[PDB]
From a paper:
In plants, guanosine deaminase (GSDA) catalyzes the deamination of guanosine for nitrogen recycling and re-utilization. The other involves the hydrolysis of Gua to guanine (G), followed by its deamination to xanthine under the action of guanine deaminase (GDA). Both deaminases are zinc-dependent enzymes, which rely on a catalytic water molecule to attack the amino group-connecting C2 atom to proceed with the catalysis. The zinc ions are tightly bound to the active site, coordinated by the completely conserved residues His80, Cys113, Cys110, and the key water molecule. AtGSDA catalysis needs two key sub-processes: the activation of water and re-capping of the active site, which proceed via the two critical residues Glu82 and Tyr185, respectively.
Despite its reported strict specificity toward Gua only, we managed to identify that 2′-O-methylguanosine (2′-O-mG) and N2-methylguanosine (N2-mG) could be employed as reasonable substrates of AtGSDA by testing a series of Gua derivatives, but the structural basis is unclear. Besides the rapid conversion of the natural substrate, the other two substrates were almost completely converted as well, because their planar purine rings almost coincided with that of Xan bound by AtGSDA. Interestingly, 2′-O-mG was different from the canonical Gua binding mode in that its ribose ring flips ~180°, which brought the 5′-hydroxyl to the vicinity of Tyr185 and formed hydrogen bonds with its carboxylate group; however, the ribose lost the contact with the mainchain of Asn140 instead. The results indicated that the starting material Gua in a reaction would completely disappear in 2 h, while only ~15% 2′-O-mG or very little N2-mG was converted into the product. By the 24-h time point, the 2′-O-mG reaction would almost finish while the majority of N2-mG was still in the substrate form. We found that the product Xan and 2′-O-mG would boost the Tm value by nearly 2 °C, which may be related to the unusual binding mode. The fact that 2′-O-mX could be efficiently bound by a non-canonical mode and acted upon suggested that the binding pocket of AtGSDA still has room for alternative binding possibilities. Actually, according to DoGSiteScorer, the 2′-O-mG-bound AtGSDA had a slightly larger pocket than the Xan-bound AtGSDA, suggesting the moderate plasticity of the binding pocket of the enzyme.
Numbering used by the authors:
A (entry chain D), B (entry chain A): 29 to 185
Write the structure that this text describes.
Amino acid sequence: SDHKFLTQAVEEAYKGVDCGDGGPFGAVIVHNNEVVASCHNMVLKYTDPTAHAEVTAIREACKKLNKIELSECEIYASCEPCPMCFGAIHLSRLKRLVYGAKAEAAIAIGFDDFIADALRGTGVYQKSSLEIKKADGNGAAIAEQVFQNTKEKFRLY
Amino acid sequence: SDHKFLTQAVEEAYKGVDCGDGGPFGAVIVHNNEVVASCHNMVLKYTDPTAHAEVTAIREACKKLNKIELSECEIYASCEPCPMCFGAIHLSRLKRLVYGAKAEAAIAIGFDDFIADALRGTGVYQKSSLEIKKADGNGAAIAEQVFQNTKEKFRLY
Ligand SMILES: CO[C@@H]1[C@H](O)[C@@H](CO)O[C@H]1n1cnc2c(=O)[nH]c(=O)[nH]c21
Ligand SMILES: CO[C@@H]1[C@H](O)[C@@H](CO)O[C@H]1n1cnc2c(=O)[nH]c(=O)[nH]c21
Ligand code: NA
Ligand SMILES: [Zn+2]
Ligand SMILES: [Zn+2]
């Protein structure tokens, strides 16, 4: 299950950067193995710097389920969510987060050094008790290669 | 000019609570004394937990200026922005943030303890660069009074 949905997020990243919607980032929100939302970064398409893949997926899933909490759903991110996106995941009350690549893989291709303290447990004020799983092995390697692969295909933002 | 725009953000908070759009939070984005956006929390109206006042103001200002960065603009928040909102403020490259009430004022009336380390200067992985001003005197009094005046005028989220 984890491998399938992380793969779907990676494919969303590739698709979004291929059609010019935004950067190579994907996010899939799932409710008991039923995909509620499958989105990618829409910053360029929407002219919205908040339209990251995770925030877009949360918005879509919440309007689809007609409620502002997703306590029965889990989110799969192709890359480690940024501070804004992790805050949005916290506010969404999503019960589990699985992400593929570490943020350093995205920083390596010139992206801003923007890492969520609450995700890595390095904060004084912001804490998290959300279940967080960093993928390993297969899906992790594939997700880390995304930034070196999608790199001549978009301009940084 | 700070007091005027902070008071406008507080007025937005009151209006949003009256409308039932969301909670008592407002945000005003300006460009050299010209209001670019004036928003309040729209979580209940939009069925969107990311639709905080600050995120909504950022979206609307970026739509108005036809770009994803607001380096020439400043933001006034009625209350101390949450981690998600401070991350959005960082991504939007706003040059200055002026906030009225400390987050403890919102916590005292039933909101979650959800405080941004980067705003208070305790961040390790996330480090802010923008100028930050906490309101004093009459602006602080107004922004703090917002939560005492709106208690049980809205549904908590
Ligand atoms: C990586 O890095 C980067 C930098 O820092 C900035 C840019 O501007 O942000 C980030 N990003 C982007 N895109 C995205 C999504 O989609 N999601 C999330 O989470 N994040 C993100
Ligand atoms: C304060 O407290 C609270 C809790 O914690 C959570 C909820 O759930 O968040 C927060 N909030 C709300 N609303 C809002 C806006 O509008 N803006 C911002 O910033 N923030 C916010
Ligand atoms: Na408005
Ligand atoms: Zn993000
Ligand atoms: Zn917020």
